């Protein structure tokens with residue numbers, strides 16, 4: 001499918017060279033940053049969407065995540081499906097696991113306090129996570145069957161909002177440096 005959304009947010013720290021490439025391709029060069037999220041996807045997320053991607057380049061030099069990323073409103077929730085990471089594997093309150101697309105993911109929930117959100121300014125909100133137990137190899141055509149995660153989260157009381165916001169395959173970095181090149185479809 002064709003992506004119709006370009007995500008490029010940075011809290012202003014360090015250098016973030018985000019390139020809006022052709023089709024569903026994008027690349028990022030970052031160094032000594034604060035928090036940032038870059039990626040391509042869809043303006044309106046869907047719980048039945050199947051995301052395809054190929055990370056030709058995944059070279060984080062510190063804390064960085066290669067992950068499906070999106071938000072919902074009512075209630076406000078930031079969710080993730082992390083396939084790979086840099087030096088830090090994200091974790092939180094363990095809820096269980098889900099097998100999908102050849103890998104096993106741990107399910108976690110965390111909370112952000114007085115943090116920036118899609119609604120601007122700052123607020124408190126919950127984060128839903130699906131983190132692969134081991135890093136998924138990159139450079140290959142990978143698939144993320146989001147329906148499997150959504151259903152798994154539901155059985156653990158993790159329900160998403162009724163108002164769906166953007167949904168993208170992104171690169172998030174936090175106080176680190178690195179490079180990534182990803183194609184989404």
Ligand SMILES: *[C@H]1OC[C@@H](O[C@@H]2OC[C@@H](O)[C@H](O)[C@H]2O)[C@H](O)[C@H]1F
Nearest residue numbers: 009035037078112115116117118120
């Ligand atoms: C999850 O990722 C980064 C950040 O989310 C950003 O908040 C501001 C908004 O304008 C951007 O589109 C979002 O990506 C959030 O604080 C964190 F929990």
